[PDB]
């Protein structure tokens, strides 16, 4: 496990597709919202 975030932005950039064109920074950067446990 490990899925920890560390930044607020988090609820923009989920509606914003970060969990799918930008993904590649919020796995690591934000993956509690994308889900990228």
Do not use: E, H, N
Not at 3 to 13: A, K
Not at 14 to 34: E, I, T
């Amino acid at each position: 496990y490990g899925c920890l975030d560390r930044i607020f932005v988090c609820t923009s950039w989920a509606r914003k597709g970060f969990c799918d064109v930008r993904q590649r920074l919020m796995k690591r950067l934000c993956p509690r919202s994308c889900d990228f446990c």
